[PDB]
């Protein structure tokens, strides 16, 4: 309670899964939240669900003009940003031999390019002492079959947390990466060819993890809140794994 | 909302520095805390500063019988442990060429051996679903002049969080390491004598860290609280660096 | 004993710097080498310096058709590949605020996209039991001012060694990253203009590294040879830092 | 061939497994080798096997006086040391609840204490520009059931490589850690309660590793040779995993 009181947050990827659970938690802690995403359907569905202190903004983070519009709205509506959660992301599986230019470009566009311009165009509004959270992944430190581009892109994300720590330290802005393991959301199964493989995919993910289950979206939200909040005021440039121990043992 | 409401915490090295700040934060978050240390005077003084919901216990973690007594007291007063913060430790500087058997044993006995037995002997009281935090250090991943044994001991600590992740996962107990950078406590002045030398040492630590300051004990406590609390319920086996970015750039 | 006797190596960016030094060492160790680069003049010059057992190939790794031609030439002349060193890359410095789409694409196209296709298109010629080395960089684990895209790209490279470990293990092909610190090549002077500025930049790099000097290209080649050779036959997926200790202390 | 020509090496743990295969390779590359260990039986068996340019020295590295005697012999016989491979080590499995003081002390004595004094007492003989290799383990970065003390001790070893890089850089002495995965030697099965579990233990180890087999002692020797040799002249403070990709994917 009150841990983000009166703070303005911007969450990309905000209309589902992790970004929605994060928006919900941020609002519970007193924040005003912008949720950003491409589908106006979900975005208003979501803003209703969250219920208070949330504005939806339609934008494709891969498009520079869409980002200019987002931040024009943030500037008009709230004046500044305290917390940026740059959370837009997407996974498509292809093995090395399967990779096509289009598959590479889609992967890097949403996971890296758009993330870079998301943060760049936030900087004029971000308050000194603000907090930026990037969504990397466990994939960024693993060797997962057919995750070639996605894992590489998520390793690039984690790298940007280090560089931006150095670049933004003079403004006391903290930049940290969160690296989720298996989280129960559409990202896990916007992949599987049926609904047969959806339950047995999660059983594998559970079996691979020390805690022995997939995480809830709310648990990832809570770790993001840690990095957003003043409780992490001496935490900078880190990679916070939230993966039930998957990468740690 | 109180994030440790009615939880029982045991903190070794809770009469000074990080451990004391953590005890104060835990009590603000509704916990009952045992603080543990060798010095009776600083224990009484710490208990008074905390002011409520605290029992001080004199125990040397390097003596097994002192641990057995600590845990009989916890058992009698509270019945079970929710959170254990194995935090006692000490730094003495010697180069490789200056190391003696006594120096080696002094460092390893409190920082590693004592920590192992602190946790082993908590196991019968730890609740399923409980949280264990070990204090490692940035030194565990650096090559600092004349910190041979201390750094090596703190790397051993970080290792044990991984092993204990694996061994305690059946009881759903999470074990995580926290690795402070420079935090403003008596530990920082381990190798200096005058007020000038101490101020100078802190200035150098500030200049070495991206955030450009020494961390406050309350900031370390807040990160420990993360790990103690339900916010980190999908976090296991990690090393959480709280060092202003020092190890991350 | 010649450690690559009669082996066929393909080196991208083999007309300058690390790639050239590696070609010379490989030829001294009995290999036949293809060096690959865009500039015809430097190719001819490099081939002459190497002096034997070398074919130079003009190819831009960022153009798929240039890779297809490279591999048709390898196929015609040698028939198969034992060692592939995907080494071409380039650094341009921009801060986050200065990044443009063009700069982003220039960095990622050669350092990541080109490297992916370089390896993908080698697969049909690579022998089972072959060795692939990727050039990452210390920048992949640091937060260096104004190296946003380059560092992120080099982290992506390191990631791909892990994925390709997993995907190519059935053919027993080893894939390893090498991560140079400061090596004395044209790459080091990417952001300077005069002879003074270059000398100064090298002095700073020397002072930053524990060994207290910039590495020679021949030292990087020797580490690549490790990874290429049978000495590293139980080494897979790694990141081999060759940086005088810079990232390790 | 000739890669350690006329160099003096000292190998602890030298009469079996990794240390013997290393002594054999070092001799093939032109070195004069001291092999050190407790059992005079094996040590002469081994020195015979190696066949040339090897002296056996009986010493228990846990005993300071035994180390003084070793280095008195090295001084008399050869005058100086070029390469030190501090390779003495031992694993006994116990879970946290099983740990006894004696089990901790045995583990830390041989893996950490003796290693520290081994290197300390070498320093007067070690040449400037010499090379020291420490045997850590994959266990030092994993969470392996019942490997509590061993893994922690091997993480302490890896730490000492960083510290000693800093302390010895002025002498241009390089210090690196090698971290073997499963290697086919008595260390693997000086553990199993029969000979039934010996073959099925190795099948598990094989199944866990990307290369899909256990390593040979000669392969670990070859990686040690890399770090001993001038091919690693710009490598300092590293952890070289030689584990068929076990820890990397
Ligand atoms: N197991 C896991 O769930 C897991 C593991 C590792 C990492 N992650 C990462 O966590 C982040 C969130 O994913 P999730 O698990 O919550 O899955 P999700 O439910 O599919 O959410 C992903 C979000 O990204 C948004 N997004 C995608 N492309 C976008 C674009 N071009 N512009 C703006 N927003 C866009 C989506 O909204 P629209 O479609 O409406 O734009 C969606 O809300 C991603 O970066 C993901 O890769 C998840
Ligand atoms: N910059 C930093 O401050 C920093 C950096 C990295 C890690 N650390 C770690 O942080 C932890 C807390 O230290 P601190 O900075 O808060 O310094 P501190 O104020 O000196 O606290 C050390 C605490 O440990 C207790 N202690 C020491 N030896 C003990 C023993 N044998 N048995 C019982 N308790 C013992 C001390 O109390 P008694 O003397 O009364 O027993 C004291 O409460 C330590 O593990 C330290 O190594 C600190
Ligand atoms: N300190 C360092 O030197 C250092 C540090 C970390 C990592 N690295 C990495 O080391 C690798 C070697 O660079 P270096 O230091 O040896 O610098 P360099 O002498 O400039 O060599 C770069 C090489 O890559 C080639 N190249 C560049 N773009 C290419 C393209 N699109 N297609 C084909 N070839 C291309 C260049 O030749 P053309 O221009 O003729 O094509 C040249 O042969 C690079 O990946 C670099 O990022 C270097
Ligand atoms: N899978 C693996 O094999 C693996 C994995 C991770 C790490 N390692 C490490 O590799 C190193 C060598 O082991 P290995 O695999 O070759 O097993 P090994 O065949 O049992 O060899 C271990 C060596 O350590 C020596 N040693 C033990 N205690 C000693 C003491 N107090 N003083 C002097 N020397 C002593 C032994 O000789 P004496 O009994 O004659 O003294 C023996 O030659 C060890 O540090 C080990 O922990 C091995
Ligand atoms: C040994 C590491 C640690 C933290 C201090 C740092 C951490 C490393 C950076 C630093 C640089 C300085 O001046 C160059 C002075 C201090 C420091 C201490 O000393 C006390 C305990 C803790 O473990
Ligand atoms: C960007 C990293 C890298 C290596 C140089 C370093 C590596 C980091 C340390 C360093 C400090 C300096 O002065 C403070 C100057 C140079 C350096 C280059 O620039 C060229 C390519 C290579 O990737």
From TrEMBL, chains A, B, C, D:
Sites where the protein binds NADP(+) 2: 15-16, 18, 38-39, 60-61, 87, 89, 150, 154, 181, 183, 185
Entry-linked Pfam families: adh_short_C2
Domain of life assignment: Bacteria
Keywords tagged on the record: Nucleotide-binding, Oxidoreductase
Annotated transmembrane regions: none
Domain Ketoreductase: 7-183
Positions contributing to NADP(+) 1 binding: 15-16, 18, 38-39, 60-61, 87-89, 150, 154, 181, 183, 185
Molecular function (Gene Ontology), one example: nucleotide binding
SMART domains reported in the protein's UniProt record: PKS_KR
Family label: Belongs to the short-chain dehydrogenases/reductases (SDR) family.
Protein name (record): Alclohol dehydrogenase/short-chain dehydrogenase
């Amino acid at each position: 309670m009150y841990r983000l009181l009166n703070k303005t947050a911007v969450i990309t990827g905000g209309n589902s899964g992790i970004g929605l659970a994060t928006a919900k938690r941020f609002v519970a802690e007193g924040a005003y939240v912008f949720i950003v995403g491409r589908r106006r359907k979900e975005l208003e569905q979501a803003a209703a669900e969250i219920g208070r202190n949330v504005t939806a903004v339609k934008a494709d983070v891969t498009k520079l003009e869409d980002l200019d519009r987002l931040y024009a709205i943030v500037r008009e509506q709230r004046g500044s940003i305290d917390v940026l959660f740059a959370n837009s992301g997407a996974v498509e599986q292809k093995t090395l031999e399967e990779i096509t230019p289009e598959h590479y470009d889609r992967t890097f566009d949403v996971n890296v390019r758009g993330l870079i311009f998301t943060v760049q165009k936030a900087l004029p509004l971000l308050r000194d002492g603000g907090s930026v959270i990037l969504t990397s992944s466990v994939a960024g430190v693993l060797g997962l079959q057919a995750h070639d581009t996605y894992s590489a892109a998520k390793a690039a994300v984690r790298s940007l947390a280090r560089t931006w720590t150095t670049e933004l330290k003079g403004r006391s802005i903290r930049v940290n990466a969160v690296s989720p393991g298996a989280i129960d959301t559409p990202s896990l199964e916007n992949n599987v060819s049926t609904q047969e493989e959806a339950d047995e995919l999660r059983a594998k993910a559970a079996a691979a993890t020390p805690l022995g289950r997939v995480g809830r979206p709310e648990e990832l939200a809570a770790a993001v809140l840690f990095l957003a909040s003043d409780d992490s005021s001496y935490v900078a440039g880190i990679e916070l794994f939230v993966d039930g121990g998957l990468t740690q043992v």
